[PDB]
Amino acid sequence: NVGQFNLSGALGTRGTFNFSHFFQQLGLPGFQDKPVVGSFGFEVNLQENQNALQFLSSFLELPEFLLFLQHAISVPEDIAR
Amino acid sequence: IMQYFSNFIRSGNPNYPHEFSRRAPEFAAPWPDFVPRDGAESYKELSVLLPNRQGLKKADCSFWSKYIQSLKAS
Amino acid sequence: YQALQNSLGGEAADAGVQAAATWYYSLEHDSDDXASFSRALEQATRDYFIICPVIDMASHWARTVRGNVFMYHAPESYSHSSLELLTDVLYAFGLPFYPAYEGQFTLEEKSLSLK
Numbered sequence: 001n002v003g004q005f006n007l008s009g010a011l012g013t014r015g016t017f018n019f020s021h022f023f024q025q026l027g028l029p030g031f032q033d034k035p036v037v038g039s040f041g042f043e044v045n046l047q048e049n050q051n052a053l054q055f056l057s058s059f060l061e062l063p064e065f066l067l068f069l070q071h072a073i074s075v076p077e078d079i080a081r
Numbered sequence: 082i083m084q085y086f087s088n089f090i091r092s093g094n095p096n097y098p099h100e101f102s103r104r105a106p107e108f109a110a111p112w113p114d115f116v117p118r119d120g121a122e123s124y125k126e127l128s129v130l131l132p133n134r135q136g137l138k139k140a141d142c143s144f145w146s147k148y149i150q151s152l153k154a155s
Numbered sequence: 156y157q158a159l160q161n162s163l164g165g166e167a168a169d170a171g172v173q174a175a176a177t178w179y180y181s182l183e184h185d186s187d188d189x190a191s192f193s194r195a196l197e198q199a200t201r202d203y204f205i206i207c208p209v210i211d212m213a214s215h216w217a218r219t220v221r222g223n224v225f226m227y228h229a230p231e232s233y234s235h236s237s238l239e240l241l242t243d244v245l246y247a248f249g250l251p252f253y254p255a256y257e258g259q260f261t262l263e264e265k266s267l268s269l270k
């Protein structure tokens with residue numbers, strides 16, 4: 001839902017980040033159901049950011065990730081804090 | 082090899098003698114988990130160097146498990 | 156669908172030959188990756204239509220004493236896809252020496268073509 005901006009029931013607009021300015025730069029209506037500048041003067045590519053969100057969503061479904069987590073828990077803090 | 086098998090009997094993992102310790106094995110190279118995906122499927126070879134290898138009999142077992150099990154399913 | 160059936164079929168397969176070739180070459184009928192599917196199919200049809208019939212004919216010609224038999228194989232190239240001639244015809248007819256292709260061939264390709 002973050003990738004598709006289906007956020008009306010999860011996000012309000014009172015916060016200090018300016019969503020109207022963000023969506024105006026992107027040419028988008030807002031919450032559904034030139035260099036673009038986002039937070040802190042970072043240049044934002046929406047398609048790359050949406051691909052990154054899709055990557056994490058599938059990354060969290062891999063059965064290999066649970067095995068990675070199990071093995072990574074055992075790595076000593078002396079070599080990886 | 083007796084230390085590999087003892088470790089598995091004691092803790093369920095050939096690499097560790099204890100369930101609540103995760104110190105790396107020193108008697109030989111670590112034994113990887115079997116991950117059932119192409120490119121993975123690692124095994125321990127019981128030779129003198131005890132190496133880790135991937136995809137045992139991949140071609141031959143594809144013949145039996147894919148082609149032959151489909152001939153018998155028709 | 157038609158690419159997979161037409162390639163290995165049309166008096167070239169019953170329902171069993173298609174399944175055997177599908178297994179042997181890892182051909183996925185219901186994929187959408189035209190790239191990978193074409194690569195696998197091209198490997199499948201090159202053997203069926205080109206390479207193995209050549210080896211069968213050389214074997215028959217040598218086994219039945221029809222004449223002297225000599226076989227070559229030109230390994231895969233990436234260099235001259237703009238030319239429609241394949242590697243064996245380009246070398247056998249000496250295209251590295253053509254004035255129209257000056258600057259496009261190395262001295263090693265000229266030396267190989269001359270041999």
Ligand SMILES: *[C@@H]1O[C@H](CO)[C@@H](O)[C@H](O)[C@H]1NC(C)=O
Nearest residue numbers: 015016017018019020021022
């Ligand atoms: C968001 O930005 C626009 C233009 O920069 C501005 O007009 C608007 O007041 C801002 N929203 C706020 C400050 O809540």
